[PDB]
Design a protein around this motif. Sequence first.
Motif, PDB file in Angstrom:
ATOM      1  N   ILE A 297      -1.135  17.584  -2.957  1.00 40.67           N
ATOM      2  CA  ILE A 297      -0.024  17.441  -3.898  1.00 40.67           C
ATOM      3  C   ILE A 297      -0.540  17.435  -5.332  1.00 40.67           C
ATOM      4  O   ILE A 297      -0.008  18.128  -6.211  1.00 40.67           O
ATOM      5  CB  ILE A 297       0.783  16.169  -3.587  1.00 40.67           C
ATOM      6  CG1 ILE A 297       1.451  16.274  -2.218  1.00 40.67           C
ATOM      7  CG2 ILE A 297       1.823  15.921  -4.665  1.00 40.67           C
ATOM      8  CD1 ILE A 297       2.049  14.973  -1.743  1.00 40.67           C
TER       9      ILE A 297
ATOM     10  N   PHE B 171       2.830   7.159  -6.247  1.00 41.72           N
ATOM     11  CA  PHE B 171       2.068   8.363  -6.570  1.00 41.72           C
ATOM     12  C   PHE B 171       2.919   9.613  -6.389  1.00 41.72           C
ATOM     13  O   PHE B 171       2.951  10.498  -7.259  1.00 41.72           O
ATOM     14  CB  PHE B 171       0.816   8.451  -5.697  1.00 41.72           C
ATOM     15  CG  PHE B 171       0.304   9.852  -5.525  1.00 41.72           C
ATOM     16  CD1 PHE B 171      -0.431  10.459  -6.524  1.00 41.72           C
ATOM     17  CD2 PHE B 171       0.577  10.572  -4.376  1.00 41.72           C
ATOM     18  CE1 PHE B 171      -0.890  11.748  -6.376  1.00 41.72           C
ATOM     19  CE2 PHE B 171       0.122  11.864  -4.228  1.00 41.72           C
ATOM     20  CZ  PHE B 171      -0.613  12.451  -5.230  1.00 41.72           C
ATOM     21  N   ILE B 172       3.611   9.706  -5.253  1.00 40.01           N
ATOM     22  CA  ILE B 172       4.411  10.898  -4.969  1.00 40.01           C
ATOM     23  C   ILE B 172       5.517  11.063  -6.010  1.00 40.01           C
ATOM     24  O   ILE B 172       5.740  12.164  -6.542  1.00 40.01           O
ATOM     25  CB  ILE B 172       4.971  10.829  -3.537  1.00 40.01           C
ATOM     26  CG1 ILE B 172       3.830  10.901  -2.522  1.00 40.01           C
ATOM     27  CG2 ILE B 172       5.957  11.953  -3.287  1.00 40.01           C
ATOM     28  CD1 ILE B 172       4.230  10.531  -1.118  1.00 40.01           C
TER      29      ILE B 172
ATOM     30  N   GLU C 132       4.115  12.205  -9.422  1.00 39.36           N
ATOM     31  CA  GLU C 132       3.832  13.638  -9.460  1.00 39.36           C
ATOM     32  C   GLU C 132       5.112  14.463  -9.575  1.00 39.36           C
ATOM     33  O   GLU C 132       5.167  15.433 -10.348  1.00 39.36           O
ATOM     34  CB  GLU C 132       3.029  14.046  -8.228  1.00 39.36           C
ATOM     35  CG  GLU C 132       1.661  13.396  -8.146  1.00 39.36           C
ATOM     36  CD  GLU C 132       0.763  13.774  -9.311  1.00 39.36           C
ATOM     37  OE1 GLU C 132       0.465  14.974  -9.468  1.00 39.36           O
ATOM     38  OE2 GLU C 132       0.352  12.880 -10.073  1.00 39.36           O
TER      39      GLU C 132
ATOM     40  N   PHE D 171      -2.405  13.780  -0.216  1.00 40.73           N
ATOM     41  CA  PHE D 171      -2.267  13.373  -1.614  1.00 40.73           C
ATOM     42  C   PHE D 171      -3.014  14.321  -2.547  1.00 40.73           C
ATOM     43  O   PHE D 171      -2.498  14.695  -3.608  1.00 40.73           O
ATOM     44  CB  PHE D 171      -2.773  11.944  -1.803  1.00 40.73           C
ATOM     45  CG  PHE D 171      -1.916  10.904  -1.149  1.00 40.73           C
ATOM     46  CD1 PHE D 171      -0.608  11.182  -0.800  1.00 40.73           C
ATOM     47  CD2 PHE D 171      -2.420   9.643  -0.889  1.00 40.73           C
ATOM     48  CE1 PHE D 171       0.179  10.225  -0.196  1.00 40.73           C
ATOM     49  CE2 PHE D 171      -1.637   8.683  -0.288  1.00 40.73           C
ATOM     50  CZ  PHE D 171      -0.336   8.975   0.058  1.00 40.73           C
TER      51      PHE D 171
ATOM     52  N   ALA E 228       1.565   4.407  -2.591  1.00 36.94           N
ATOM     53  CA  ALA E 228       1.566   5.819  -2.206  1.00 36.94           C
ATOM     54  C   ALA E 228       2.862   6.513  -2.624  1.00 36.94           C
ATOM     55  O   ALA E 228       2.849   7.633  -3.162  1.00 36.94           O
ATOM     56  CB  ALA E 228       1.346   5.945  -0.699  1.00 36.94           C
TER      57      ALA E 228
ATOM     58  N   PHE F 127       0.828  -1.201   0.000  1.00 32.29           N
ATOM     59  CA  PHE F 127       0.000   0.000   0.000  1.00 32.29           C
ATOM     60  C   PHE F 127       0.867   1.257   0.000  1.00 32.29           C
ATOM     61  O   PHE F 127       0.643   2.192  -0.783  1.00 32.29           O
ATOM     62  CB  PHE F 127      -0.924  -0.035   1.222  1.00 32.29           C
ATOM     63  CG  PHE F 127      -1.816   1.161   1.357  1.00 32.29           C
ATOM     64  CD1 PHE F 127      -3.043   1.196   0.722  1.00 32.29           C
ATOM     65  CD2 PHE F 127      -1.438   2.244   2.129  1.00 32.29           C
ATOM     66  CE1 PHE F 127      -3.868   2.288   0.846  1.00 32.29           C
ATOM     67  CE2 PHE F 127      -2.260   3.340   2.253  1.00 32.29           C
ATOM     68  CZ  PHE F 127      -3.476   3.361   1.612  1.00 32.29           C
ATOM     69  N   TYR F 128       1.882   1.286   0.862  1.00 33.08           N
ATOM     70  CA  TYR F 128       2.782   2.428   0.910  1.00 33.08           C
ATOM     71  C   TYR F 128       3.714   2.473  -0.289  1.00 33.08           C
ATOM     72  O   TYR F 128       4.173   3.556  -0.656  1.00 33.08           O
ATOM     73  CB  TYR F 128       3.570   2.407   2.217  1.00 33.08           C
ATOM     74  CG  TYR F 128       2.683   2.599   3.422  1.00 33.08           C
ATOM     75  CD1 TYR F 128       2.064   3.818   3.660  1.00 33.08           C
ATOM     76  CD2 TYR F 128       2.440   1.560   4.305  1.00 33.08           C
ATOM     77  CE1 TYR F 128       1.244   3.998   4.749  1.00 33.08           C
ATOM     78  CE2 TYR F 128       1.621   1.731   5.398  1.00 33.08           C
ATOM     79  CZ  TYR F 128       1.026   2.952   5.615  1.00 33.08           C
ATOM     80  OH  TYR F 128       0.207   3.132   6.702  1.00 33.08           O
TER      81      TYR F 128
END
Lengths: 33, 44
Positions: free
Chosen positions: B42, A10-11, A14, B39, A7, A3-4
């Motif tokens: 961001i 995702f970071i 971006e 999230f 995450a 799960f992390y």
Amino acid sequence: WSFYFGALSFIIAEMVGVLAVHMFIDRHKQLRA
Amino acid sequence: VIDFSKPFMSLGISIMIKKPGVFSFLDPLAYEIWMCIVFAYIGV
């Protein structure tokens, strides 16, 4: 931890998108000059 | 069958039962909400 992993993905996605947008902008500013 | 004096102690039947966090200001919203807020910030 997976799960992390998602995450953190995702970071990082971006941030890399922001980097690509800056490269595009820089290419067009160099073309302008 | 025996002689009692006046009560030297009064009692009755009674009920016996068994007798804030630092970051408790976050408690109204769930942890997933705070994480997804970060999230969404961001992404926005």
